[PDB]
Design an enzyme around this catalytic site. Sequence first.
Site, short mmCIF file in Angstrom:
data_model
loop_
_atom_site.label_atom_id
_atom_site.label_comp_id
_atom_site.label_asym_id
_atom_site.label_seq_id
_atom_site.Cartn_x
_atom_site.Cartn_y
_atom_site.Cartn_z
CB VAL A 50 7.85 -33.92 27.14
CG1 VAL A 50 7.92 -34.98 28.20
CG2 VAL A 50 8.65 -32.90 27.10
CB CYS B 68 6.74 -28.25 26.15
SG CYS B 68 5.94 -27.46 27.13
#
Lengths: 477, 477, 522, 522
Positions: free
Chosen positions: D156, D152
């Site tokens: 991001v 992640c």
Amino acid sequence: MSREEVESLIQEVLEVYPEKARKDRNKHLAVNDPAVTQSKKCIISNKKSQPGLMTIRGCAYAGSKGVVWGPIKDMIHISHGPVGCGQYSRAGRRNYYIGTTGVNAFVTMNFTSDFQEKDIVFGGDKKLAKLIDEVETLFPLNKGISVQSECPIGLIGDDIESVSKVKGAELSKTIVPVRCEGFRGVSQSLGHHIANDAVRDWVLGKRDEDTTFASTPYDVAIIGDYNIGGDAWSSRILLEEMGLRCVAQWSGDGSISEIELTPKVKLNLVHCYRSMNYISRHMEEKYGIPWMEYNFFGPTKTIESLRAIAAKFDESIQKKCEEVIAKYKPEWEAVVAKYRPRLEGKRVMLYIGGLRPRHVIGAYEDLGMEVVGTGYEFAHNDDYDRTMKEMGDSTLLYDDVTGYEFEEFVKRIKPDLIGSGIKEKFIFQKMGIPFREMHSWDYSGPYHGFDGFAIFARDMDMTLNNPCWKKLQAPWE
Amino acid sequence: MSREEVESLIQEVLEVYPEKARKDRNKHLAVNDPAVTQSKKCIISNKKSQPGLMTIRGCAYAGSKGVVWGPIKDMIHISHGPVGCGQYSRAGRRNYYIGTTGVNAFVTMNFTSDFQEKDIVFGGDKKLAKLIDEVETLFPLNKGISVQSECPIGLIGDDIESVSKVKGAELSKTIVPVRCEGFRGVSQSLGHHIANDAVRDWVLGKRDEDTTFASTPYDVAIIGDYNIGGDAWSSRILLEEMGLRCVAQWSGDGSISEIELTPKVKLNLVHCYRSMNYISRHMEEKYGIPWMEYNFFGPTKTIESLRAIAAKFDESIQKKCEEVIAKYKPEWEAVVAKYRPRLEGKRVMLYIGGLRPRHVIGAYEDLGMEVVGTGYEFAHNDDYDRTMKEMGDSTLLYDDVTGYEFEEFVKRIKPDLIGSGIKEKFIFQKMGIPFREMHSWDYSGPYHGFDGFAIFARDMDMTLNNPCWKKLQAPWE
Amino acid sequence: SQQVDKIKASYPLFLDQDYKDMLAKKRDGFEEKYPQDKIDEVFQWTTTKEYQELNFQREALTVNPAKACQPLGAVLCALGFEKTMPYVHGSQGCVAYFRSYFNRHFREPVSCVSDSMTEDAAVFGGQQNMKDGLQNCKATYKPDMIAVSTTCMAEVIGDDLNAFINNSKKEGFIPDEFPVPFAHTPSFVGSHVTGWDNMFEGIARYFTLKSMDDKVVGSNKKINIVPGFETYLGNFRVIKRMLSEMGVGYSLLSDPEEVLDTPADGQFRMYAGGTTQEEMKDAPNALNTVLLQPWHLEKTKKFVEGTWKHEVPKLNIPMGLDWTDEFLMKVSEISGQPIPASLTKERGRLVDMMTDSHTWLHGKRFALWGDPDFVMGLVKFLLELGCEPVHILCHNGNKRWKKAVDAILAASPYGKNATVYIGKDLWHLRSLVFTDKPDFMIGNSYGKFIQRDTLHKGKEFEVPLIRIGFPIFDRHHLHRSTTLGYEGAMQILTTLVNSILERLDEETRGMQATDYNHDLVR
Amino acid sequence: SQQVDKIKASYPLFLDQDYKDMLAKKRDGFEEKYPQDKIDEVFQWTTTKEYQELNFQREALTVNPAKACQPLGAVLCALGFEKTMPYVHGSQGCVAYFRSYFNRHFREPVSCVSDSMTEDAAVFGGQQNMKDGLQNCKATYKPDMIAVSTTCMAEVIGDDLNAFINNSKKEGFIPDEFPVPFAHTPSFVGSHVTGWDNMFEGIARYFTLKSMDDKVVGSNKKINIVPGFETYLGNFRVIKRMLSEMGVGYSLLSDPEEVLDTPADGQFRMYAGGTTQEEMKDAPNALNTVLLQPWHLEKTKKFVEGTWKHEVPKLNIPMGLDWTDEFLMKVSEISGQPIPASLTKERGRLVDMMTDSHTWLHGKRFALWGDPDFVMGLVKFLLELGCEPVHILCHNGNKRWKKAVDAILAASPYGKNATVYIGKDLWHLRSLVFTDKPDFMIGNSYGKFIQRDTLHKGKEFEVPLIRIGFPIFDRHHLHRSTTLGYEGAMQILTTLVNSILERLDEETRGMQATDYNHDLVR
Ligand code: ICS
Ligand code: ICS
Ligand SMILES: [Fe+3]
Ligand SMILES: [Fe+3]
């Protein structure tokens, strides 16, 4: 199928037999005509099985040890002989009981003399006496011992009656020798008779001179209910809601003391006529106790039986009978409303032992179900006399049906359901026909009484309408 | 082997790396020389992992949520972010506790904000506030909430401190924001430091102005014992047999109230220096509480630690310490007599996290076992300073060992046993080398104290001397 | 009473208040039951060492045996031949019981006939029964072969099967060329496995004894496999699979796997698969014969070594790692086929599972029972797993088998606390598990009662049962399992370790009492 | 204290009196625990319908989810290709967790690398991490392929995997011809199965997108099989076995069965088996592609239908009788191969087991959870068995899948009391099993905690767990099971019926209380 088609089917099935077997087997198959009553006209029963035809019948040891004596909970039953007979019958029959197994109850245990070669050659009487001593040492709370003879006992000249008398006198213990060797008779039925005679000769008259039992005019004994899956209990509760005192249960969840107390009852309620009519007639002759047959399969039969039983007593019992019927009416009416629409018009073929092939017909008809074929392993002519009026017109009747015969009959008749024993279950399941075990209730039940009727309807519906029966043919065939 | 052979092995293992990785990894492998006890001279630690080399290291979230905060039983720990981090760490660590899970204890539960795309794009502060409200509604007996940040929280600009302050003021609840995002630091160690700072800033000073706790001169706290398989309990009993009152356990089976009561103790007993030295130094600076390191692995270390701890108190505690040692001497002596003959001379290689690679050496030597190789995932230079004197001469030291490195070292050294984590266990079992999980104790334990030593010896013997290890080669090969 | 929307069967219907009151009234009024304190005192007494000493002094009484009689094994052996009807000369009750027993274990049809010998035959023999029965069976069920065993009644009166069958063929009841192999299977000698051995020897003798002149050992490049009394279909299947993997030509004599696993497709198949008469006739031409269960194949071994001239290898039952390895190596030596890479991989996978599960399996104490070969294979595998067999019971074992099992136990440090019992029944074993409590039992369904008894002493005294063996009546489709080879070893290992873990989960499920050890990961 | 002869682990060591006293002193002195009556009150409250209403009003809090994040599935998919290293560009903690998770489920080594992106990469990106990581991984572990997913943090941050890998090849860190397929696997989208789908689509695109000109559909006479996220080795094996029995040429794309089942023979094999690069390159030449788990292979379906031009059949997961039949018939239609007699026999044997066990299976109530395709296959099979699924939970399900499952339930009278929940976690399911109690749960190991909770309400309220699904941590070697096809249906049937019978035996084991129904034969 009409009567003519059933007779033609019988003849075509019989065609493959050799001449002697064909001539014998023709006497044991019939098309029911409820316009007549005699079984000396259509079906011959209680004959020896034809060799090599896959009879479903058992032996006299099964009829005595497995049926009558085995359920008696506080007694220890010795399978006298080789290991096999006791091992195969251990806990195979669901004669339910309450007790501490191995301490004061011994129903599901296998006690055997485990005959070896030396016992065959030199006899087993001394081994039997030593065995009884060991039983007394290791199970001190047993209230009696029975000695069920297996096949070799009667062939080697063993005298179990003398051992029983001597050991019983020495130990102040009821020791009952039962000459139920499997080669006696032709089925379990002679086992029933031998076990009944053993009860009469060694147990029943124990308290003849005893008068310390407080008896009431509502004293009854349930005879011939072996508490299969709790059946007897489901019966007993109703009889006790009617104001009766059930003194004895023969022999499901039965104790030896309550067998000894049976000659003190006012009425003998006989469920299984086949296995216990002998002792019922004996008690009628000796103690003047009347006995009556009753049927607790399904609500119609149960209500009729309850009213007939209450009619033997005063008006208070009749009022209580009406109260019980009113109490249970909504329950079985709800059962019918739920399950009859899913079972209406379904056709059943039954093959069971001596009582159930006719006794359970009323429950099936209470569910809207039609019995098109029925038959018995070991019933006598009186059972077929009773069956003729319980069975519909042009329905098939079979006695000691062979496996080939039953499979061919099912192939032609094509019933929606077959109710029979464990030895037919998987055969007919593989043909895509729903099967219900009508001996063990398929490890379900009870089926007696209203509480049993709910379970019976649930079981019939769950098996007949199971999705699996629609999936036997592969979609690519 | 000798020191020269170990240096040669290091060089041959390193020659496969690219130049930059080789130059880095050469600084993290050393041959122990206990005469020289400087980690500024031999091994470099607490550096970033080389990319793509299969490091065994975890992240700062594992160091904070999985290690320090998670064991606190009456607190609810929110894995703030996507579902993965909370799911993979749920009940993976055996930090044992007593409580009613889901009612007053929440250790093995996974609370998460389960971030979706919209939470990433528009932030998750409002979702966090709503989540805290829902936690209050559904778990009213929780005594506090922690918010463990996963990786996206620090990258999308979320302000969990403001939400924590506002919601804590609104609900009169301790809400601890922990900035333990996995990209911070290089391993679990920075997670330890961040969690310690969070404890210091949000929990520890709660009862600074409170003086209603009745304190005794024998008040101690257990810091850095996470009750793996009950380890802390097996420690605590000994400390309470010595006459000490253990006020707090950090954080295995730990409650928030006992953490708040820690500033009232007389002595801080630090088991895991690596994870809790920050809070120990802080409590020394602020409350003047001395702290000392101790080792409860094996009887020798346990006896030494008990005597050193008792030396901090009066003569009554020392007499009780001698009594405890005398009471437990026969038990661990019997353990040694039973198991040392089967483990004498066996060689072990260890690779664990920050404390155990040096702490368990004493137990192995108590069983006659020799640690020939040891290393740490995330230890600092002070840990290697402590390890150099605990480890034998010419033994192998590895920091942040790669999978290839560890496999090659094991191939050359050929230890009798390997103690490491779940990610090495099956690799080394497939090579025919007995393996013991030295994180989870292979779902066994505890290993602390004398009671733990018995289990440790039994486990080492059962794995090292298992028959299966003699059966890996087929007899036809 | 019954609620139509929630109907109760016997359990828990009889736990209702009205049924409880009625049962209490029955007990207090008419049962004359011993007081409950006396019942408890006698139960506690039966759990003790003094009771065990009295129990092991038994000489004449047998309580809850773990064995059957010979004709059951004879029937199972006969069921493994193509279109073959098992025919038990004697009393029909025996056949009813045999069929019910096998039906309950396999949940499949079991075809077997009797000639229904009655009391009159007990005086002048069952010759007429034999003639009519053979004719009727052949006419009705149309087998290609009728395999004849005996009930104890026929053995006691001394019916001569050979003479009866010869007279049946002489008088036209059956064709002279129709195969009617026979065996004497007295129920008072040995057990069901002995009946299997006798029946197989009778069939092999019937098909090979008179035609040995043209036989040449090894002429057909095959290995004979005699499985013996086997009630796991997986064992037949795994033997065939492993032999096919090696490319080894084989002949599985007495293969009942097909007829005990017929599909439910709308028709009943009385016969399916099985060893053909041609295979049995050609059997002496094999390279060798391998006996999978040699401890109840002694008569078969004597016939095969003395008539077929096969040098039957000294092989244990291929159970567990070492004995499967020895079986595969012997087969490779006999056939000349190397052990293939797939079998090596399978062995390595079994070893990987052993290493994965050894921590949970190590030191666990087992009381086990069953047939001799199965029991010794299980004991060997348990020793390989670091488990402790403590009570080893084989009701139908003998002194020589006990000596072999003691030798197996002596070779392992994990057999130090093991005792082997022969001629003891499950009441003896109940005493043993009460007085020297193991962690688990391994046995057939009868052991469930022992478990009940132990639970009555207390939860901490309860010995859970693991159902491996014959018969299994209270679980479904376990007869499809495998116990032989690496596959069977993997199945047994999984069963054992997961039984241990299930027991541990049960013992640690108490919230705030024992759930500190209710670990997610084990 | 410890007895050297009988050493106690944590259970039952901490049940000793001294440990109990010490724990009570700890609780009473320092824990400031809520009074036990308050704890009992709150627990009873959590069992109620009002608590369930509050529970199902949750919008932001998730408690005990039944799903993982995408890179786990990406790693599992990458493990199914020959000599392929899963490479998760991003943070190393994710890779540590993925490896631990898969190690605990499979009890096998799981090889995966990270490029260890740290706080500096949070500002500049992970380009340097990618270059160094690919070079180091290729040099050290020598894969033939590196399959790249993301954590992640990288998603991001906005790391462009394609540009990073292209720059790595442009600057000499890895050879230009070395295969480096990639996929973006954001953990905040979907779940682990979505990661599997993305990774497989990335690999297929990498190997086929630019070389479609010479591809001819059906030229290699094979069928592509995409299994999807699968954690039972038996499922891969059974698909391969059934296709081989049919004589159907097939290509199992992403086959991790070998590398997850390596033998323990003295050496560690990092790579074993797997789909070859040649198979993936030739995949567009297949007759068709069959998606075994279509509900999480939507991106793969779009790619296969739009680029390979394969008319992917509308097939459910081949779970249970009807769907296995449909799968086999579709494969027969595509390949032209008839369904052989062995498969017909196997189906008939499954039907035989269904008829054998229907009385015990009929009407039983099940809560269940898992991945969408698995859950709907289980629901279909349960309906085929006459069982009642009551609580159907799929945390990672969607509205369309819920509509399909509701349509499946509507087609059967046994689905009348069935509710499908999507987006609900295991705390929701805890509420459901407390308020509308089923007979059993079917799910992964996390359900054990629910079982504990139910047992705390009472023994009569306890809902036993049946472990089918992923992950299974507290039992050994269940990952070797099969859930697909007739074999998987037989395994599931046996598990269900014997779980029912084990529960009944436990409930009827009370001597002189419930043991009247402790039947030997069931
Ligand atoms: S005793 Fe008889 S065969 Fe009347 S031997 Fe048999 S438990 Fe049957 S039809 Mo099994 S005459 Fe009872 C019987 Fe009926 S064992 Fe049960 S079901 S009502
Ligand atoms: S806290 Fe640390 S890695 Fe000191 S993060 Fe780790 S339960 Fe290890 S060597 Mo797992 S510094 Fe504890 C540890 Fe040691 S999780 Fe446990 S075993 S003594
Ligand atoms: Fe493994
Ligand atoms: Fe079947």
